[PDB]
PDB file of C-alpha atoms and ligand atoms in Angstrom:
ATOM      1  CA  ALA A   1       0.000   0.000   0.000  1.00  0.00           C
ATOM      2  CA  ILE A   2       0.755   3.685  -0.382  1.00  0.00           C
ATOM      3  CA  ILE A   3       1.114   5.320   3.058  1.00  0.00           C
ATOM      4  CA  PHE A   4       1.651   8.850   4.391  1.00  0.00           C
ATOM      5  CA  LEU A   5       2.470   9.100   8.093  1.00  0.00           C
ATOM      6  CA  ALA A   6       5.302  13.503   7.997  1.00  0.00           C
ATOM      7  CA  UNK A   7       5.839  10.019   3.202  1.00  0.00           C
ATOM      8  CA  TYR A   8       5.006   2.662  -1.081  1.00  0.00           C
ATOM      9  CA  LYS A   9       5.507  -0.174   1.420  1.00  0.00           C
ATOM     10  CA  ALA A  10       1.547  -3.344  -0.368  1.00  0.00           C
TER      11      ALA A  10
ATOM     12  CA  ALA B   1      -0.661  10.203  14.358  1.00  0.00           C
ATOM     13  CA  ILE B   2      -2.040  11.629  11.126  1.00  0.00           C
ATOM     14  CA  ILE B   3      -2.224   8.868   8.494  1.00  0.00           C
ATOM     15  CA  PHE B   4      -3.160   8.591   4.814  1.00  0.00           C
ATOM     16  CA  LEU B   5      -3.447   5.043   3.458  1.00  0.00           C
ATOM     17  CA  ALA B   6      -7.024   5.889  -0.254  1.00  0.00           C
ATOM     18  CA  UNK B   7      -7.615   9.227   4.628  1.00  0.00           C
ATOM     19  CA  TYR B   8      -6.126  11.204  12.798  1.00  0.00           C
ATOM     20  CA  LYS B   9      -5.858   7.878  14.649  1.00  0.00           C
ATOM     21  CA  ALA B  10      -1.695   9.174  17.743  1.00  0.00           C
TER      22      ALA B  10
ATOM     23  CA  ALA C   1      -1.645  -4.068   3.203  1.00  0.00           C
ATOM     24  CA  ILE C   2      -1.964  -5.287   6.757  1.00  0.00           C
ATOM     25  CA  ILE C   3      -1.831  -2.386   9.200  1.00  0.00           C
ATOM     26  CA  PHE C   4      -1.723  -2.059  12.991  1.00  0.00           C
ATOM     27  CA  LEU C   5      -1.772   1.479  14.369  1.00  0.00           C
ATOM     28  CA  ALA C   6      -4.123   0.507  18.955  1.00  0.00           C
ATOM     29  CA  UNK C   7      -5.926  -2.870  14.371  1.00  0.00           C
ATOM     30  CA  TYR C   8      -6.341  -5.517   6.231  1.00  0.00           C
ATOM     31  CA  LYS C   9      -7.003  -2.325   4.212  1.00  0.00           C
ATOM     32  CA  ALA C  10      -3.631  -3.427   0.196  1.00  0.00           C
TER      33      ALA C  10
ATOM     34  CA  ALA D   1       2.178   6.280  16.922  1.00  0.00           C
ATOM     35  CA  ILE D   2       3.079   2.621  16.888  1.00  0.00           C
ATOM     36  CA  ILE D   3       2.768   1.224  13.365  1.00  0.00           C
ATOM     37  CA  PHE D   4       3.041  -2.245  11.819  1.00  0.00           C
ATOM     38  CA  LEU D   5       2.632  -2.457   8.057  1.00  0.00           C
ATOM     39  CA  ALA D   6       5.638  -6.659   7.181  1.00  0.00           C
ATOM     40  CA  UNK D   7       7.446  -3.092  11.603  1.00  0.00           C
ATOM     41  CA  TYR D   8       7.350   3.740  16.780  1.00  0.00           C
ATOM     42  CA  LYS D   9       7.277   6.727  14.381  1.00  0.00           C
ATOM     43  CA  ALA D  10       3.694   9.613  17.121  1.00  0.00           C
TER      44      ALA D  10
HETATM   45 CL1   CL E   1      -5.829   1.261  10.997  1.00  0.00          CL
HETATM   46 CL1   CL E   2       5.940   1.102   8.670  1.00  0.00          CL
HETATM   47 ZN1   ZN E   3       6.344  15.945   6.984  1.00  0.00          ZN
HETATM   48 ZN1   ZN E   4      -8.700   7.548  -2.073  1.00  0.00          ZN
HETATM   49 ZN1   ZN E   5       1.006  10.444  18.896  1.00  0.00          ZN
HETATM   50 ZN1   ZN E   6      -1.315  -4.303  -1.436  1.00  0.00          ZN
END
């Protein structure tokens, strides 16, 4: 998945 | 924390 | 993805 | 926050 937590890990 | 995964949980 | 942030969304 | 996405960033 695409995650923004402040920046693909899915 | 503020998280965007596609939207505060901290 | 599987996420735990405290709980599949991938 | 504590995050597990597979691993404290809060
Ligand atoms: Cl979550
Ligand atoms: Cl992570
Ligand atoms: Zn930033
Ligand atoms: Zn969206
Ligand atoms: Zn916090
Ligand atoms: Zn995925």
